[PDB]
Swiss-Prot record, chain A:
It comes from the Eukaryota. ANK repeats lie at residues 1-29, 30-62, 63-95, 96-128, 129-161, 162-194. The keyword Electron transport does not apply. The gene is PSMD10. Changing residue 175 to A: Abolishes interaction with RB1. Part of transient complex containing PSMD10, PSMC4, PSMC5 and PAAF1 formed during the assembly of the 26S proteasome. Stays associated throughout the assembly of the PA700/19S RC and is released upon association with the 20S core. Interacts with PSMC4. Interacts with RB1. Interacts with CDK4. Interacts with MDM2. Interacts with RELA. Associates with a CDK4:CCND2 serine/threonine kinase complex. Interacts with ARHGDIA and increases the interaction between ARHGDIA and RHOA, hence promotes ARHGDIA inactivation of RHOA and ROCK. This is 26S proteasome non-ATPase regulatory subunit 10. It comes from Homo sapiens. GO terms for molecular function: RNA polymerase II-specific DNA-binding transcription factor binding; transcription factor binding. Keywords: ANK repeat, Apoptosis, Chaperone, Cytoplasm, Nucleus, Repeat. The keyword Methyltransferase does not apply.
From Swiss-Prot, chain B:
This is 26S proteasome regulatory subunit 6B. The gene is PSMC4. It comes from Homo sapiens (Human). It is found in: Cytoplasm; Nucleus. Keywords: Acetylation, ATP-binding, Cytoplasm, Nucleotide-binding, Nucleus, Phosphoprotein, Proteasome. Component of the 19S proteasome regulatory particle complex. The 26S proteasome consists of a 20S core particle (CP) and two 19S regulatory subunits (RP). The regulatory particle is made of a lid composed of 9 subunits, a base containing 6 ATPases including PSMC4 and few additional components. Interacts with NR1I3. Interacts with PAAF1. Interacts with TRIM5. Interacts with ZFAND1.
Curated annotation (Swiss-Prot), chain C:
The lineage of its organism: Eukaryota, Metazoa, Chordata, Craniata, Vertebrata. GO terms for cellular component: blood microparticle; cytoplasm; cytoplasmic vesicle; cytosol; cytosolic proteasome complex; extracellular exosome; inclusion body; membrane. ATP binds at residues 30-37. Component of the 26S proteasome, a multiprotein complex involved in the ATP-dependent degradation of ubiquitinated proteins. This complex plays a key role in the maintenance of protein homeostasis by removing misfolded or damaged proteins, which could impair cellular functions, and by removing proteins whose functions are no longer required. Therefore, the proteasome participates in numerous cellular processes, including cell cycle progression, apoptosis, or DNA damage repair. The keyword Acetylation applies. Residues 26-213 are annotated as: May mediate interaction with PRPF9. It comes from the Eukaryota. This is 26S proteasome regulatory subunit 8. Component of the 19S proteasome regulatory particle complex. The 26S proteasome consists of a 20S core particle (CP) and two 19S regulatory subunits (RP). The regulatory particle is made of a lid composed of 9 subunits, a base containing 6 ATPases including PSMC5 and few additional components. Component of a complex with USP49 and RUVBL1. Interacts with PRPF19. Interacts with TRIM5. Interacts with NDC80. Interacts with PAAF1. Interacts, in vitro, with the thyroid hormone receptor (in a thyroid hormone T3-dependent manner) and with retinoid X receptor (RXR). Interacts with ERCC6. The keyword Cytoplasm applies. One of its GO terms (biological process) is positive regulation of proteasomal protein catabolic process. Belongs to the AAA ATPase family. Its main location: cytoplasm. One of its GO terms (molecular function) is DNA-binding transcription factor binding.
Length: 206, 236, 213
């Protein structure tokens, strides 16, 4: 719609004039089942989303799949949007299409501040999606050791079984991250859990 | 990440040195071998080299040399090899060698025996094509259990690139290399789209994202989302 | 460590040369370090005779139009292996039937190559009628210094290199690792661009070939 370009392009005075012209544009949505909050949050414009959240737009609005704007705040890497959405009361455990949490998309982007803010508000470090995978799997496979360590600051588990049966130590050994492997083993990661392939973490590492 | 890196380091890095390889006369092994029956392959790399490098390109789909004339073999492979060694540093992409690489039947039918003796003749020619020649012979197939080790002898095909299925790393980087330029949002996911395409075999994932942009180019949706990603999965 | 194979092979291969029964075939079983192809091609090279390398019946057509020659099964070296291999075993059965039947010239022999249960299958198909038995022991270091020298005369080598450490410091699997060190030393010789005969960079190649073993 019009608020999609007024929100994504950053037309501050034009979006404020559109809201003041018609209050319905704050809740109208296009075929993407998204309001202007999703577009302006996706683009990173803090003032527009502070005007929309100032008027009181429902922060828990989900699209056709079930995506909450906190996943934009975490994946996009905008700390101030995390402060605004967590300030307004965004759901830290909102279920999307595949059942993932914003912690997974903050760990994927290696955003430490967003992980500290979301986990500080009461996020679940061991939240599992439809594939039964946590943020430590993909954060341990992409090579994010500091994300793993700050997850361990919030009492995160290191022995989550994936849909194949692998653990974050398996995905860490697959990437051949010797520092993450030896560090996770030193922290207490079970080297005895076997996947469907019957491969131990010591066998996966080369 | 290691597949395409092996294709570049094994193909395009020695390709620019042929103008010098004609002078110093030290030619590395040209044989590049691809594999993997589940993954399609064989096109993204031939087109990637076809666009990156500016050289001569002689693509031959399958075995063009199954003509009933037994004496036509050396004329065909000799013409291709003489335009490769004389015209320009052409890259000979011989795909699907499983047809002529294995003897079929009926030994007394000296046509196949004679053209495989010609295969041994051009085998000695590619033995001689390791010194002062602008030859490039890349090879691809899908089943190695029927291939004779004569072509795969150590010293002829020394670049065995394996590709059974696209690993999760090339998935994540091939999604990031297209969402980094196009519009990015939260609905663009990498976990279910790094796990599901690991179960279901799918090629040209970058072209699938471009087709998704062609489904979100309708001037109604401004940021590409998972609706056209999964829709592109169930349609193309 | 291959002096027994050349010593014993001179009276077998070199018999129809100047002495004028003639042995028909011979087999060598063991770890394929050295002496399976380098011996037939080295003796066939010093003898200045023809030596062509080596389908279940078309290989016998090649071994029919090219029957008189020094032949050696090099390309092939229970449910499907005894039959699929038994096609080449039949090929050499009728080859021994031709060689046992008639000959156009002398110095015509065939050498077999097998290192597994198919040796017991060959003895199951050969009831000690016409065959020579020569054991194939693993090559010692004496069979490695001279094979590194012969495999080093082709490429340019400096006069200050110590072949004792690089030749004697390659134990373990087999003697083909010498040829692998030569080829990889040529790939790192192209990679590192040795100027003419630089010795320190040849020692760098020694490191780059000792890091893979």
């Amino acid at each position: 719609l019009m608020v999609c370009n007024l929100a994504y392009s950053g037309k501050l005075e034009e979006l404020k004039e559109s809201i003041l012209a018609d209050k319905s544009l704050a809740t109208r949505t296009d075929q993407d089942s998204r309001t202007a909050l999703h577009w302006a949050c996706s683009a990173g414009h803090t003032e527009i989303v502070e005007f929309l959240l100032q008027l009181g737009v429902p922060v828990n609005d989900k699209d056709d799949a079930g995506w909450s704007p906190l996943h934009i705040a975490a994946s996009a890497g905008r700390d101030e949007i995390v402060k605004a959405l967590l300030g307004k009361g965004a759901q830290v455990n909102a279920v999307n299409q595949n059942g993932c949490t914003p912690l997974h998309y903050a760990a994927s982007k290696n955003r430490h501040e967003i992980a500290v803010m979301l986990l500080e508000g009461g996020a679940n470090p061991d939240a599992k999606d439809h594939y039964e995978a946590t943020a430590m799997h993909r954060a341990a496979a992409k090579g994010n050791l500091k994300m793993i360590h700050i997850l361990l600051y919030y009492k995160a588990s290191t022995n989550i079984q994936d849909t194949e049966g692998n653990t974050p130590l398996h995905l860490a050994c697959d990437e051949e991250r010797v520092e993450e492997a030896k560090l996770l083993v030193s922290q207490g990661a079970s080297i005895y859990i076997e996947n469907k392939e019957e491969k131990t973490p010591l066998q996966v590492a080369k | 990440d290691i597949q395409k890196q092996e294709v570049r380091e094994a193909v395009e890095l020695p390709l620019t040195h042929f103008e010098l390889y004609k002078q110093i006369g030290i030619d590395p092994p040209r044989g590049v071998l691809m594999y993997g029956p589940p993954g399609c392959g064989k096109t993204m790399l031939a087109k990637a080299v076809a666009h990156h490098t500016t050289a001569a390109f002689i693509r031959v789909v399958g075995s063009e040399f199954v003509q009933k004339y037994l004496g036509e073999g050396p004329r065909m492979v000799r013409d291709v090899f003489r335009l490769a060694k004389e015209n320009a540093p052409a890259i000979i992409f011989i795909d699907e060698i499983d047809a002529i690489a294995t003897k079929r039947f009926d030994a007394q039918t000296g046509a196949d025996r004679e053209v495989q003796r010609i295969l041994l003749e051009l085998l000695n020619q590619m033995d001689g094509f390791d010194q002062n020649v602008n030859v490039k012979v890349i090879m691809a197939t899908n089943r190695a259990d029927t291939l004779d080790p004569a072509l795969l002898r150590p010293g002829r095909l020394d670049r065995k690139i394996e590709f059974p299925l696209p690993d999760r790393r090339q998935k994540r980087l091939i999604f990031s290399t297209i969402t980094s330029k196009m519009n990015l949002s939260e609905e663009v996911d990498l976990e279910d789209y790094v796990a599901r395409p690991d179960k279901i075999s799918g090629a040209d994932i970058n072209s699938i994202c471009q087709e998704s942009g062609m489904l979100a180019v309708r001037e109604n949706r401004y940021i590409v989302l998972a609706k056209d990603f999964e829709k592109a999965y169930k349609t193309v | 460590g291959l002096d027994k194979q050349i010593k014993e092979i001179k009276e077998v291969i070199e018999l129809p040369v100047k002495h004028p029964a003639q042995p028909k075939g011979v087999l060598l079983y063991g770890p394929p370090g050295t002496g399976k192809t380098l011996l037939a091609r080295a003796v066939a090279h010093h003898t200045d005779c023809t030596f062509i390398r080596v389908m279940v019946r078309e290989l016998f057509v090649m071994a029919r139009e090219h029957a008189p020659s020094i032949i050696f099964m090099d390309e092939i070296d229970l449910e499907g292996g005894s039959g699929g291999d038994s096609e080449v075993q039949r090929t050499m059965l009728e080859l021994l039937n031709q060689l046992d039947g008639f000959e156009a010239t002398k110095n015509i022999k065939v050498i077999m190559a097998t290192n597994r249960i198919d040796i017991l299958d060959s003895a199951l198909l050969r009831p000690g009628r016409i065959d020579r038995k020569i054991e194939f022991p693993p090559p010692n270091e004496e069979a490695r210094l001279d094979i590194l020298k012969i495999h080093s005369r082709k490429m340019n080598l400096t006069r200050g290199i110590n072949l004792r450490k690089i030749a004697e410091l390659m134990p373990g699997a087999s003697g083909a690792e010498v040829k692998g060190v030569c080829t990889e030393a040529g790939m790192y010789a192209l990679r590192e661009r040795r100027v003419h005969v630089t010795q320190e960079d040849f020692e760098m190649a020694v490191a780059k070939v000792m890091q893979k073993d």
